[PDB]
Amino acid sequence: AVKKFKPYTPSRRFMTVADFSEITKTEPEKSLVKPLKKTGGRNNQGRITVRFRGGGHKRLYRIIDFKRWDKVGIPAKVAAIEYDPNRSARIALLHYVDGEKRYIIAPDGLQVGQQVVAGPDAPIQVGNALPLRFIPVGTVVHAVELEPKKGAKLARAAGTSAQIQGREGDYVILRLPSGELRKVHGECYATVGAVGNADHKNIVLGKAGRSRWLGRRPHVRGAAMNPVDHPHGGGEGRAPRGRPPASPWGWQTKGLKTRKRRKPSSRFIIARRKK
Amino acid sequence: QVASGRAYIHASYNNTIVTITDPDGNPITWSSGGVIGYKGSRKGTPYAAQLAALDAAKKAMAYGMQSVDVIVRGTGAGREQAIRALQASGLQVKSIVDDTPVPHNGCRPKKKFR
Amino acid sequence: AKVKATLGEFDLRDYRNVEVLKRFLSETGKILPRRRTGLSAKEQRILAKTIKRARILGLLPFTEKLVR
Amino acid sequence: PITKEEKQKVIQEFARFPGDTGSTEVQVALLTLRINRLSEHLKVHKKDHHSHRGLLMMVGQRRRLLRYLQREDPERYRALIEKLGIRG
Amino acid sequence: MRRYEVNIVLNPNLDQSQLALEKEIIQRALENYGARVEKVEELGLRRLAYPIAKDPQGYFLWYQVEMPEDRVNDLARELRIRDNVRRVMVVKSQEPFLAN
RNA sequence: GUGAAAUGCGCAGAUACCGGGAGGAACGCCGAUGGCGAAGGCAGCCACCUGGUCCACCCGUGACGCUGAGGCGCGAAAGCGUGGGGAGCAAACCGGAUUAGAUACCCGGGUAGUCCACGCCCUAAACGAUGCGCGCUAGGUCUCUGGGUCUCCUGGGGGCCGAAGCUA
Numbered sequence: 001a002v003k004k005f006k007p008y009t010p011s012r013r014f015m016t017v018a019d020f021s022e023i024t025k026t027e028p029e030k031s032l033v034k035p036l037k038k039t040g041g042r043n044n045q046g047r048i049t050v051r052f053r054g055g056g057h058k059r060l061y062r063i064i065d066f067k068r069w070d071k072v073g074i075p076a077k078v079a080a081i082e083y084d085p086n087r088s089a090r091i092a093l094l095h096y097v098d099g100e101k102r103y104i105i106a107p108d109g110l111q112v113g114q115q116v117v118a119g120p121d122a123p124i125q126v127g128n129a130l131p132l133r134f135i136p137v138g139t140v141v142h143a144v145e146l147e148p149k150k151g152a153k154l155a156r157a158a159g160t161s162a163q164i165q166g167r168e169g170d171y172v173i174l175r176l177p178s179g180e181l182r183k184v185h186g187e188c189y190a191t192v193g194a195v196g197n198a199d200h201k202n203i204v205l206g207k208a209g210r211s212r213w214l215g216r217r218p219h220v221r222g223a224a225m226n227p228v229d230h231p232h233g234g235g236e237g238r239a240p241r242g243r244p245p246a247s248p249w250g251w252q253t254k255g256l257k258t259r260k261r262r263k264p265s266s267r268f269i270i271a272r273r274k275k
Numbered sequence: 276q277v278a279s280g281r282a283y284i285h286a287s288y289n290n291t292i293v294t295i296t297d298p299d300g301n302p303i304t305w306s307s308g309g310v311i312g313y314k315g316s317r318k319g320t321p322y323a324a325q326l327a328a329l330d331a332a333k334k335a336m337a338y339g340m341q342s343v344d345v346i347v348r349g350t351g352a353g354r355e356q357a358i359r360a361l362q363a364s365g366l367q368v369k370s371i372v373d374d375t376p377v378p379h380n381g382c383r384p385k386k387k388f389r
Numbered sequence: 390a391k392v393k394a395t396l397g398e399f400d401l402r403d404y405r406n407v408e409v410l411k412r413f414l415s416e417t418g419k420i421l422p423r424r425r426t427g428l429s430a431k432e433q434r435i436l437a438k439t440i441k442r443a444r445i446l447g448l449l450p451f452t453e454k455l456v457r
Numbered sequence: 458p459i460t461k462e463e464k465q466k467v468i469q470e471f472a473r474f475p476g477d478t479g480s481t482e483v484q485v486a487l488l489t490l491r492i493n494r495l496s497e498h499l500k501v502h503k504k505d506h507h508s509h510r511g512l513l514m515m516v517g518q519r520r521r522l523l524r525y526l527q528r529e530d531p532e533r534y535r536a537l538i539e540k541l542g543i544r545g
Numbered sequence: 546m547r548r549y550e551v552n553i554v555l556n557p558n559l560d561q562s563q564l565a566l567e568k569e570i571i572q573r574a575l576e577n578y579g580a581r582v583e584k585v586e587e588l589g590l591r592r593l594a595y596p597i598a599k600d601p602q603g604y605f606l607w608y609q610v611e612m613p614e615d616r617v618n619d620l621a622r623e624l625r626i627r628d629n630v631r632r633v634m635v636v637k638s639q640e641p642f643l644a645n
Numbered sequence: 646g647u648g649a650a651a652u653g654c655g656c657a658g659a660u661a662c663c664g665g666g667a668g669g670a671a672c673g674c675c676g677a678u679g680g681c682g683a684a685g686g687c688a689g690c691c692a693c694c695u696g697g698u699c700c701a702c703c704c705g706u707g708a709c710g711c712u713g714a715g716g717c718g719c720g721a722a723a724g725c726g727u728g729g730g731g732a733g734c735a736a737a738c739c740g741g742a743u744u745a746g747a748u749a750c751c752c753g754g755g756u757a758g759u760c761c762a763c764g765c766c767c768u769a770a771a772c773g774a775u776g777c778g779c780g781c782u783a784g785g786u787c788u789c790u791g792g793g794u795c796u797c798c799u800g801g802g803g804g805c806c807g808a809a810g811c812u813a
C-alpha cells in the first residue's frame with residue numbers, strides 16, 4: 001500500500017507513510033551493523049561541500065553484500081526482510097547453510113522463508129545471482145556490477161531494475177533503469193528480479209519536518225539572495241532570471257550537458273537516456 | 276557487375292518506382308516516374324510507370340544485367356504496365372511474384388483509409 | 390473442386406497432420422472458405438481453430454508470396 | 458470446477474432419504490457450494506463482473522428456497538442454515 | 546488430473562549429445578511438475594513454414610501426459626526457460642473429430 | 646502528396662531494396678443474412694479460473710411462482726485522479742492549400758487522448774426508438790445449435806415471407 005492519515009493536523013492531511021508490510025524483523029543483525037559517521041555535507045577540510053544537509057535521525061549502517069560471487073554455490077535461506085535507514089530498498093537477511101549471515105537488497109518477489117543462491121549454474125529464479133552471460137535475455141534483473149568483481153553498482157533503488165537486451169561478444173546489453181542502453185561485461189553479476197518497495201516513489205512527505213528527519217536542511221533560492229550570493233540574486237522587488245539561469249557557481253543550469261566529452265566509458269554507452 | 280538479379284516494382288497511387296537489385300538484394304539502379312520526367316499526378320500513370328521500368332532495365336543492362344526476378348508491390352495503376360515494360364526490355368523475367376505488404380490488422384490507418 | 394471430398398478419413402483436431410491441412414490454404418496461405426473446402430459450419434470452425442494452432446507450431450505458414 | 462463426487466458427497470450429505478435428489482435441503486446445499494466457490498473466485502478475480510451476476514442469481518435462488526422451507530418447517534430451516542452456517 | 550499434449554520445438558543445430566541433454570532437463574521437469582507421461586512421439590527435424598529463431602528447420606517433440614490442472618501453466622514457463630527451447634505449446638487433449 | 650497543388654522530406658544522401666535491432670498497438674484469411682451475453686459489449690493461439698444456456702433421460706422437490714416502488718450491482722465512447730507505456734492514429738494547436746473569404750471539408754506536421762494498473766465519472770440515435778412473464782391464434786423458405794427411427798420428425802436460437810387479426 002502506502003498509508004494515508006486522516007487530516008487531523010493540517011500536515012497529516014497529505015502526508016503518506018510507507019506500508020512496511022513486507023518487513024518482518026525490527027532489529028538489525030547486531031553483527032552486521034556498524035555506525036555511520038554523519039558528514040553534514042562537509043569534507044575533510046571542514047568545508048561544506050554539498051549544501052543544506054544535516055540533522056537527520058541517527059543511523060546504523062547495515063553492511064550489504066554487493067558482491068555475492070563471493071560465495072558461489074553456497075545456498076541460503078531468506079531469514080527476514082528488514083528496514084534499512086540507509087536505502088530506499090529493503091534488505092533481506094540471508095542465513096547461508098554455511099552458517100554465514102549477510103544482507104542483500106530485497107528484490108521484489110522474495111518471500112521470506114525461501115532459499116536462494118549465486119553462481120553460473122544458479123536457477124533463474126528471483127533473488128539469485130549469476131554472471132550476466134548466463135542470464136537469459138529479456139529477463140529483468142537488478143543490483144548489477146558495472147565491471148567484474150567490482151560490486152553491484154546499477155539498479156539498487158527501491159523499484160529499480162535493468163533488462164538484458166541481447167549479448168554481443170564479451171559484453172551483454174542493458175537498459176539501465178534510466179533507459180540508457182549500455183554494454184556491461186558478461187562476467188558481471190546481477191541478481192534476478194527487480195528491487196522491491198517499488199511504491200517508494202509515491203510517498204508524500206507532507207510537512208517541512210519530515211524533510212528534516214531525512215537529513216535535508218532547507219534549500220534557498222538563487223532568486224532569494226543578493227548578488228554577492230548567486231547569479232540570480234538581487235533586483236528591486238521580484239525579478240526573473242535576467243540571464244540564462246545558473247547555479248551559484250555560474251554555470252548554466254537548463255539543458256547544459258555536463259558529461260566529460262572524452263570519457264572512456266563512452267565507447268560502451270549505446271543510447272543515452274530518454275525523456 | 277552481375278548477369279542476373281532482381282526487379283522491385285513499387286506501385287502506389289501517386290507513383291511507380293522501380294529498382295533493379297543484385298543477387299543478394301542490394302541495388303544497382305532504380306527509377307520512378309519522376310526520374311523519367313513527370314512531376315505531380317502524371318507520375319502515377321501507367322505510361323509513367325512504363326518509361327520508368329524501361330529506363331530501369333536499360334540502366335541495369337548497362338552494368339551487365341540480363342536475368343531478373345520481378346517483385347511487385349502495391350495495388351497501383353502502372354503496376355501491370357510496369358511488368359509489360361520489363362519483359363519487353365530485353366531482360367529475362369525469370370519469374371513474377373506479388374509481395375505487397377499487408378497488415379494482419381496492424382496499425383490504425385490515416386483517416387483517409389476509413 | 391471441393392477439398393472435403395479429395396481426402397478420406399481425416400481428424401479435424403489433428404493440428405500436426407500437416408499433409409491434410411495444407412490443402413486448405415490458398416496458394417498465398419490464406420485459410421480457405423466453405424465455398425472451396427466444402428465444410429459445414431461446425432466443421433469449418435474446428436479446422437480453422439487448428440490450422441492456426443499449426444501455424445504457431447511452425448508447420449503451416451501465416452502467409453506466402455503470390456507467384457505467376 | 459466442482460468434482461463430480463464432491464457434488465455427490467453433498468447431495469448425499471443433505472438428502473432427506475437415501476433416494477433423494479433435488480429436495481429443498483439438497484438444492485440449498487448444492488447452491489451453497491456453487492456460491493461459496495464463486496465468492497472465492499471473485500475475491501481474486503474482482504474484475505470478473507458477469508460471473509458476479511451469476512452469483513447474484515444463485516444467491517437469490519437460495520434465498521427463495523429458504524423462505525419457502527422456513528414457511529413449511531421452521532426447525533428444518535433453522536437446521537439447514539445452521540449446517541451450512543448461513544444467517545449473517 | 547487431466548490429459549494434455551505438450552509439444553516442444555528445440556534448436557535444430559544441436560548434437561545428439563546436447564539434444565539429449567535438453568531432453569533430460571525436459572523429462573526431469575515434466576516429472577518435477579508431476580507430469581505423468583503416457584504416449585511420447587519424438588519426431589526430430591522438419592522444415593518449417595517460417596524461420597523460427599531465424600532458422601528454417603526445427604526439432605520436434607510431443608508428449609501426451611496426465612498432470613494436475615493447476616501445475617500445467619508453470620510447467621510451460623519452466624519448459625521455455627532455456628535459450629534452446631524454441632516453442633512450447635501445451636494443449637488440453639481431446640477426442641479426434643473426423644470428416645467422412 | 647492532391648481534383649490539381651503547395652507546405653514537408655531529400656546530395657548534410659531522402660525515396661525504392663536487402664540484413665540486424667527496438668517498441669507499442671490491433672489480430673488478416675477463417676468471417677457469415679454467423680455465435681455469445683441482461684444490457685453496455687465480446688474476435689490470433691495456449692492453459693487455468695468462472696457465468697449464463699440448450700438438449701436428452703423423465704429420476705427427485707411438491708406452487709417453492711410472476712412482477713418489482715426504494716436499495717444494490719453492472720454500464721460504450723469521451724472525460725478526471727495516481728502511476729506506467731507511447732509505434733500508428735489523433736481533438737487542441739502550426740503550416741500548405743481550396744475559396745469571395747475558409748477559425749472547416751483536402752494536404753504536410755502535431756500535444757492530450759487512444760494502450761496498462763488501480764480508483765472515479767454514470768452518459769448516448771445505451772434503438773428493435775418496441776419493459777418482464779405466462780397462455781392462445783396458418784403456413785412457406787433460409788440458418789445456427791441439440792436430440793431422434795437420421796427421407797424426415799422433434800427442442801432452442803438468428804432471418805425472411807406471409808393466415809387471421811391489429812394499425813393513422
Ligand SMILES: [Mg+2]
Nearest residue numbers: 001019021022
Ligand atoms: Mg505492498
Ligand SMILES: [Mg+2]
Nearest residue numbers: 003004005006
Ligand atoms: Mg486512512
Ligand SMILES: [Mg+2]
Nearest residue numbers: 004005013014
Ligand atoms: Mg494522509
Ligand SMILES: [Mg+2]
Nearest residue numbers: 004005006007
Ligand atoms: Mg490516522
Ligand SMILES: [Mg+2]
Nearest residue numbers: 007008009010
Ligand atoms: Mg486542522
Ligand SMILES: [Mg+2]
Nearest residue numbers: 009010011013
Ligand atoms: Mg490543512
Ligand SMILES: [Mg+2]
Nearest residue numbers: 018019088200
Ligand atoms: Mg520507506
Ligand SMILES: [Mg+2]
Nearest residue numbers: 019020021022
Ligand atoms: Mg515495505
Ligand SMILES: [Mg+2]
Nearest residue numbers: 026027028060
Ligand atoms: Mg533498534
Ligand SMILES: [Mg+2]
Nearest residue numbers: 030031033034
Ligand atoms: Mg559492532
Ligand SMILES: [Mg+2]
Nearest residue numbers: 035036037061
Ligand atoms: Mg561509517
Ligand SMILES: [Mg+2]
Nearest residue numbers: 043044045046
Ligand atoms: Mg578527519
Ligand SMILES: [Mg+2]
Nearest residue numbers: 044045046047
Ligand atoms: Mg583541518
Ligand SMILES: [Mg+2]
Nearest residue numbers: 042046047048
Ligand atoms: Mg561547515
Ligand SMILES: [Mg+2]
Nearest residue numbers: 049050051052
Ligand atoms: Mg552543494
Ligand SMILES: [Mg+2]
Nearest residue numbers: 041051052053
Ligand atoms: Mg549541508
